[PDB]
Symmetry: C3
Subunit: 144 residues, 3 copies
């Protein structure tokens, strides 16, 4: 079945909201609000240890936010890759830029893969994975 335009834009907006929360370099609560409590936050596709649940996502961003100075996550090329009414999936391209407090830059040219579920507070992410389109530029050490 076809994804309603309303839901396509909602899911895009969730992803853009996640980018905004990361790009604060501070607002963990805003990051967590994107995800269900049980969410799989699995960035093993770019070489980072998987995390599950809000506690794991919090740990991840406590570290990232402590280590990073500036961030910008540009999301483009949104495509609905599945829709089953109460659940959906969406792909986007990312230009994920950062500079650490240690001065070291990073740019990821890759893809975000979101799985989402319709909840009483809107669409939320149940699973998030990634991969590369280009070889990593710089370092992911400040996210480890």
């Amino acid at each position: 079945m076809q994804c309603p335009i309303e839901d396509r834009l909602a899911i895009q907006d969730l992803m853009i909201a996640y980018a905004h929360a990361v790009d604060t370099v501070s607002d963990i609560d805003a990051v967590l609000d994107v995800f269900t409590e049980d969410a799989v936050f699995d960035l093993s596709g770019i070489g980072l240890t998987p995390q599950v649940g809000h506690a794991g996502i919090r740990e991840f961003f406590t570290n990232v936010f402590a280590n990073m100075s500036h961030h910008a996550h540009y999301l483009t090329n949104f495509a609905v890759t599945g829709y089953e009414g109460d659940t959906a999936s969406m792909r986007a391209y990312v230009i994920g830029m950062g500079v650490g407090k240690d001065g070291r830059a990073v740019t990821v040219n890759g893809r975000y893969f979101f799985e989402v579920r319709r909840t009483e507070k809107g669409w939320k992410a149940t699973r998030y994975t990634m991969d590369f389109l280009m070889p990593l530029s710089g370092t992911l050490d400040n996210a480890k």
Copy 2:
């Protein structure tokens, strides 16, 4: 108040029209058509001198277009941040690239903030501000 999809897309289109006008590196009338007659064009958030009104905005671009050779303003991550019916607010990320006639490059990784009004000729910008997501690469001297 939720912004209708038709208006959301119209406001995005306006912002993309602005980027197109800037990227002509010549069409000041097209730039001015984005803006209300009394619009605030305030780029102080990226270090430039603010202007108010079409005369000011024309001055700003007479200089920029005199000094620049090539422009590209990629806009992404659009988000409605306010909607009051006849007024609205939208955020976008920009990758703002330029090369001067003097050969000096600039890239702004930042954000646009548009405030818009519904007019007899469609949505138009009443205020435009910016800030950075990453430290400025290159120079904004060709826009001063």
Copy 3:
């Protein structure tokens, strides 16, 4: 006199076709998926960024057989989508591209440019009948792995 307004469903369908084209290019392999974007008769004319024009599926297939043979990685980011024309069963759309690649020879390329798609409604949906490009910034790298 207002031109005929492009319906939202069609605007999104045409955007999606262009994003599908980028996806196909970014497989660095799937010529069939690339060709699915175009009418059999399509004009594939990238002379605006310095490449030789092609016409039809045969020509597009030749083009990508070469590109895919020479390239290691691709990323084609498309942004600033704008409907530039709509006549009902035909339309046109502009997009900005950040077209990135690295060759098997290790040479990088980045195109900062624009895509211009002219599309037609078919029984299998909107398809591209003409595709052209130009630059917003001076080419970074070579398009020799696309030549």
